[PDB]
Amino acid sequence: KKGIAKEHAKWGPAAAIEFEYDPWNKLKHTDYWYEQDSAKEWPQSKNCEYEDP
């Protein structure tokens, strides 16, 4: 029968929907957890190349 994924996961048309924004810590939304250096501990995201450091 016709249905939506909300009723049951079997109707889910998409498996993984990756959503990201603000690769570089510009808006200070996330405070990276660091012990020695924040940049070294956390590798740069793939999308970082699309924004000015």
């Binding site: 996961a9 079997k10 889910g12 998409a14 498996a15 993984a16």
Partner: protein
């Protein structure tokens, strides 16, 4: 028994590649990670779903019934 139809975490369909996964492990003698990467599994959820699965259906079918 059988490989899960969809990944528990994301829901990606991984049951199609289970036979392909076994063939790659046996026919090509490839390691687990390389075979899974070739099959097209990026997220580790599907990686652990396929790697951690156990084929108890074959064991059950060994009996006469």
């Amino acid at each position: 028994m059988i490989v899960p139809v969809r990944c528990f975490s994301c829901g990606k369909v991984v049951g199609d590649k289970w036979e392909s996964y076994l063939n790659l492990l046996q026919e090509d003698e490839l390691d687990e990670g390389t075979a899974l990467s070739r099959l097209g599994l990026k997220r580790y959820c599907c990686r652990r779903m396929i790697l951690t699965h156990v084929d108890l259906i074959e064991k059950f079918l060994r009996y006469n019934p």
